[PDB]
A paper describes a structure:
In black-grass, upregulation of a phi (F)-class GST1 (AmGSTF1) has been shown to be a functional biomarker of MHR. Recombinant AmGSTF1 has been shown to exhibit both glutathione-S-transferase activity toward xenobiotics, as well as acting as a GPOX, reducing fatty-acid hydroperoxides to less reactive monohydroxy derivatives. The Phi (F) class GSTs, of which AmGSTF1 is an example, are found in all higher plants, being homodimeric enzymes in which each protomer of approximately 23–30 kDa with the catalytic serine residues located at the interface. Each protomer has two distinct domains; the N-terminal domain adopts the typical thioredoxin-fold, with the C-terminal domain being a bundle of at least five helices as demonstrated by the crystal structures of AmGSTF1 presented here.
In spite of extensive crystallisation and soaking efforts, no crystal with any substrate bound or any alternative crystal packing forms of the wild-type protein were obtained. Based on a careful analysis of the crystal packing, the key hydrophobic contact stabilising a crystallographic dimer interface shown in Fig. 1b was identified and three protein variants were designed to facilitate alternative packing. The core structure was found to be virtually identical to that of the native protein. However, the previously disordered loops in wild-type AmGSTF1 were now well-defined in the Phe112Thr variant and, for the first time, a glutathione molecule was determined as being bound in the G-site, confirming the validity of the design strategy. The Phe122Tyr variant therefore adopted the closed conformation for the two loops over the binding cleft with glutathione bound in the G-site.
Residue numbers in the entry:
A (entry chain AAA), B (entry chain AAA): 3 to 215
Write the structure that this text describes.
Amino acid sequence: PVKVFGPAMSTNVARVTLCLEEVGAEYEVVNIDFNTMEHKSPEHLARNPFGQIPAFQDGDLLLWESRAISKYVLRKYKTDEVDLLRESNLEEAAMVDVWTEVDAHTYNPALSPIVYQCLTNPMMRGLPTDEKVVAESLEKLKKVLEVYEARLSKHSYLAGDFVSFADLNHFPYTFYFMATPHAALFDSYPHVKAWWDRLMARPAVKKIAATMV
Amino acid sequence: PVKVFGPAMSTNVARVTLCLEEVGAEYEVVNIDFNTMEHKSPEHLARNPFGQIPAFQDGDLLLWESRAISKYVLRKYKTDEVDLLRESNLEEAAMVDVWTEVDAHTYNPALSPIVYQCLTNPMMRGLPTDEKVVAESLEKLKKVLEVYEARLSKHSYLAGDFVSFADLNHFPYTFYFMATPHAALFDSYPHVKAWWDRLMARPAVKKIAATMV
Ligand SMILES: N[C@@H](CCC(=O)N[C@@H](CS)C(=O)NCC(=O)O)C(=O)O
Ligand SMILES: N[C@@H](CCC(=O)N[C@@H](CS)C(=O)NCC(=O)O)C(=O)O
């Protein structure tokens, strides 16, 4: 098998987790304890020089950074009935690259603060939640989902009329947003709600969402 | 040719600019004025729905997000004497993916604040610079370049013993860091200084660094 280092709870781990469950590869999730500073430990720095989760072992190959790990997985285990990067078609490719990078640079940075603040703060590491920061991040996110509604009224998926890495990347952080009080926000954006429910009801996503409780 | 929308001054534009000058493709840089809010204008939203620079036109193909644009360019114009993504070798590939994503998630976020604050603030948009934020970002960056020195003592480039996209990604923001008072920081990190000067003295980089003044 291949080894994935981090808690399953973790969103950046779920990212990699899912990409394996979509490509029906055999894998083990070796946990890492944050309370024990296991991720700063010397065993882990031999995987990730920056001592963050997740990392990845394929025999004598050692990989960090959830999106580089995911590409690598998807390229390696490419069936004809599962090409979620579309490297054959150069233009389909570009439109997975573009919505992969909307998640990392536009969507996640507007959404991730509402989770952390409404959820990681109180549930983990029990500090309070900042009205100032949740309120701002919502407005920021409302005007971002205006573009998603537009795109997801023309296409069934961000990339085109097919599931891609770009769809999957949006799964882990969005899944935790769905447990905040503000999860009814997506109701107001029906074509995005539609695309959500389409993702939620894949077999692979149905599995991994087990591993997030 | 192909059209790249944004000021050449711009770092995310330089990213795309360079990738074309490395692959000897024919291109025009159509400018966009920030003072006139040209990037929020309706012509531009037809390129980038989020009304940020840069965007990209290859005939009837419209692309945003400097790193997705760059992949697309590099894949498209792939000679045998210029494969800066290494998609043939799956493992070389992964090690361009990993250091591409170190720039976006670890390096840039520690370095970009020292530029913006020491340079964009006073030079552009004339507000002051925050000691609190420059001081912190340096410490953050010193412990990041400790990993770069280690990696660049084993290999000549981040990826392996070859120039890659991962090397190029580090160019634009680092080039502006080189004009702050703190540019002598890299002196303390000789193998990184070495790798810098190796990049600085390519023909393509020698051109694009013209287009950043
Ligand atoms: N953005 C990176 C890293 C994600 C990340 O930093 N993970 C967190 C999980 S809570 C972590 O390890 N934080 C602890 C630390 O960075 O010290 C990726 O692509 O995986
Ligand atoms: N990170 C994105 C976008 C970079 C970006 O946001 N560019 C700036 C250049 S100053 C911009 O357009 N800022 C104005 C705005 O976003 O409103 C990429 O991969 O190109």
